[PDB]
Subunit: 240 residues, 4 copies
């Protein structure tokens, strides 16, 4: 049985990814930063289905002198639990506005660029160095119609498109595929967003995102590398 | 009942693999073909041996002309006549040959290249929608932005198909119809291409230094028509082994 | 010694502005038109009063048909016949109207795909066969967030991006550059109520206004200039940031 | 009163070409430089000899650090200190080297590649906007960012982030009348270290003329974007690549 690392797996999209990979037959490393209770609750549910198939791993993914070691630790944890590491899902993300005109700004850089781009880079290095192997990066379908005042966030998501493509090229000789899934929209403010989605009749779910990840790690995607699949209900096609 | 799909240019290569994989999934299929009647009929025989009454053939030229609308309406009508429903449309048929800018008539080249690649998909899409997990899949080209030299009209047609995929995804979403694309890089090489040229192409692909099988292309089509893609519309999935990422 | 340019759909609006600015820059111009004969002639008369023997008109339907190749060959030949050379081609003419998925549809195809794509393709072939040479295609900045029910128009504009790129690649060895200018919202329809024009104007980040024809023309003048000698295959958005705005 | 521009990494090569052409157009210029002090001063002397009191130098490391925000505020402040205004910012300075995924610390590489290429442009854009007519920012991008060189992941990440900044800042700064655009070279001046044969390998790939862009040709696109002939253009990235990005493998 193969093994997968999912970053930010305690909640929301990462949790759904971890569940679906587990349902597919993977052993999973559930990475978390602050959500230890939720991480361990998930691992408890998964291990009750199949014993010793889920572990947790704590790491802050903010950029800092120690982030490379932290990322090597996450990958190492998968090898120590399971003896292998077939899949890496870069799901963890920080998200908040950083206006250009008026935490320090450099802490924002560390958290937005670090979590969203540099940690994926370092995880990707550690994953490859230790080697159907495939990395999936959680991108953003709205990368080229960005939210107002989200410059740093958007820079980091752009940088992650760059990583996806550069790592796809560079790791292809090692048989490692590298792809992305780009959610769009995944309560008055929540309804405003839902009514703009062309496929709005359906509610967006974490499960839907997870379905795309499962496709890309599967044997049905064996020739796919460097691809980013939008899972956005058509929202990125909608003009202002 | 079992859902039903139309696959254009289904007698051979990628279209044939799509038809087979849809039929293995549970769909009843219309095997559209233009010249390859023996292959189309042999495929329908094979599929019907596995399940009776689950495949039919439909012949049509998809070159643009004043009767193309009627031809495309007839292909969708053929699926309703055989199966009583039409759930999936795969726009696979394509003309492909060079049209140099500097030295068949050029109008015939337009009709064939733009017709098969773009206008026939558009008209099929209109007829599919009008006749109503509904979904259209367009076979695009991952190398559309790094085109082969002297293939202007082909490239124009494949860009127009990207436009149709996006415009139809937007317009048809209220009707429950998803519209997506699959973009091969190099898959099955042309029957006419020489051995040495085939190898040159295969050596460029980062992922394995080989072309995609037809079945690998079909696998992406399968995903996009499946319930695991219910929130995906307007997306074009490259299935190219990294080839579009490789600089000159 | 003065260079010459063909501008399609040049009687009015953006094409007229382009023609004027090329003339101001020193080009002799072919003013192509379809229905707008009085406006095309008034422009040519205006430009020839500024400098004699610097403007002609050429009428043609750019709808696709059996005869479109010969029409496009004629348009290019008209520049050589008047001016002895053809340095610049600007593919500006365009049909634009909705074609809902749910005039015959084949006439719509001929018009929308012809004007926006096939005529540019044929003009490009005739331009190159007859040879700072450069083609500029008028594209659409909103081609990836299209208007609802405009599929044929959007198909046509996407095909023109493909032509721009394919032609840039193939014509580079002949020294011919091929680029695009992609407006967002520029001159609004004639009949459109101010209330409706203002809904579009308020979307534009940059000044909450549409581009003037002149501002589109300025990008065309840049691309044909010596300041753009290394630029080919590029499409310059002239959209005030409109394509960057989410739903 | 003549307008004023800041050009990062302006002592040599493309940055020098941009500073020169902005000066020739009538701008007063801040020539930012990190290590090329003798080249920066030689350039400022040449410009000042053409028109007195129209060029100054400004030294800064654009590596990311906790002081980078102050450094970037000081670069902008230097233009107001010399000239009393700052109309144009050209983000040109760039670190460029390979960072292979499979085997300077990697943190230092991050700080240098992502700092120069992305974070410093972001901090400079914040400081330019805060200190505020034809105001505009031009970011030096990379036409090949989608067909990247092997083993240049961090560089490519930084250039992709710069695309994002160009678009996000165009959107946010448009209400203030500040336009934000890019110029994306393909191959222009080849690296100083590169041998002739390897330079020719790159040259032979370019459709338009089988040669690299001159520095002047890159600067031409920057001058257009900062001109009144680009007054409606914001969020646009102009490729200046001779067709290179269109060439398949
Ligand atoms: N929701 C959407 O609509 C949407 C749209 C576009 C893109 N996406 C992308 O899809 C992925 C998942 O989205 P989501 O909404 O599920 O994400 P989310 O809940 O915003 O964040 C997922 C997890 O990231 C982890 N994380 C945040 N900062 C961290 C740090 N400094 N160190 C380590 N881990 C950290 C957190 O884990 P702990 O709770 O353990 O601390 C958090 O629960 C993300 O990459 C996101 O950018 C989502
Ligand atoms: N193979 C590749 O590497 C590759 C690369 C990029 C994109 N693609 C795209 O993927 C799809 C499948 O590729 P493929 O190589 O399998 O295609 P193909 O063998 O070139 O063509 C598929 C079929 O199209 C039909 N077709 C051609 N002209 C037609 C016309 N005028 N009217 C009706 N049908 C016509 C033919 O049917 P009959 O045989 O019945 O006459 C032909 O067998 C195509 O859309 C293609 O553009 C393929
Ligand atoms: N205005 C905008 O906001 C905007 C937005 C995006 C893209 N664009 C593009 O920018 C260009 C200029 O826009 P515009 O608004 O100035 O264009 P326009 O007024 O819509 O059309 C320009 C001219 O095209 C000619 N034309 C139409 N159908 C023709 C046919 N069948 N045969 C030959 N010529 C035909 C007409 O010439 P006659 O009058 O002589 O018949 C017309 O005056 C076009 O390519 C357009 O698609 C404009
Ligand atoms: N040349 C090309 O073909 C090409 C291709 C694609 C993109 N570009 C882009 O176009 C721009 C100009 O290219 P170029 O070749 O002229 O650039 P370059 O010579 O590689 O670099 C320009 C300047 O960047 C400065 N720089 C480097 N690290 C720095 C740091 N840590 N702090 C502050 N400044 C630093 C250096 O200043 P000092 O010398 O003063 O230390 C250097 O002279 C760059 O943004 C580049 O990425 C160029
Ligand atoms: O058979 C094809 C082919 O191999 C290739 C192909 C071969 C080499 C390189 C490439 O980018 C495509 O393109 C096709 C496009 C359309 C079509 O209908 C068939 C082919
Ligand atoms: O006049 C036009 C127009 O205002 C617009 C337009 C109006 C509102 C929003 C928009 O994105 C474009 O588009 C056109 C496209 C082609 C053409 O030939 C003319 C127009
Ligand atoms: O000098 C450079 C260069 O020639 C090239 C270059 C050389 C060959 C191919 C290519 O696509 C770029 O890229 C650079 C990118 C950043 C930078 O700061 C300088 C260079």
């Amino acid at each position: 049985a193969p093994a997968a690392v999912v970053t930010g797996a305690a909640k929301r999209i990462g949790r759904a990814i971890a569940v679906k990979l587990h349902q597919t037959g993977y052993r999973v490393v559930i990475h978390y930063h602050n959500s230890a209770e939720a991480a361990v609750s998930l691992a408890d549910e998964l291990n009750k289905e199949r014993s010793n198939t889920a572990v947790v791993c704590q790491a802050d993914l903010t950029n800092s002198n120690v982030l490379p070691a932290s990322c090597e630790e996450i990958i190492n944890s998968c090898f120590r639990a399971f003896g292998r590491c077939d899949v890496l899902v870069n799901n963890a993300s920080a998200f908040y506005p950083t206006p250009l005109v008026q935490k320090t700004v450099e802490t924002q850089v560390a958290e937005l660029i670090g979590t969203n781009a540099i940690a994926p880079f370092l995880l990707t290095m550690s994953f490859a160095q230790r080697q159907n192997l495939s990395i999936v990066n959680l991108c953003d379908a709205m990368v080229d119609q960005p939210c107002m005042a989200f410059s740093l966030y958007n820079m980091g998501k752009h940088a992650l498109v760059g990583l996806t493509q550069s790592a796809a090229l560079e790791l292809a000789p090692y048989g490692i595929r590298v792809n992305g899934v780009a959610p769009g929209v995944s309560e008055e403010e929540k309804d405003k967003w839902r009514r703009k989605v062309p496929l709005g009749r359906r509610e967006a779910s974490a499960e839907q995102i997870a379905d795309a990840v499962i496709f890309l790690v599967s044997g049905s995607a064996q020739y796919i590398t460097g691809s980013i699949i939008k899972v956005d209900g058509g929202l990125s096609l909608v003009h202002a």
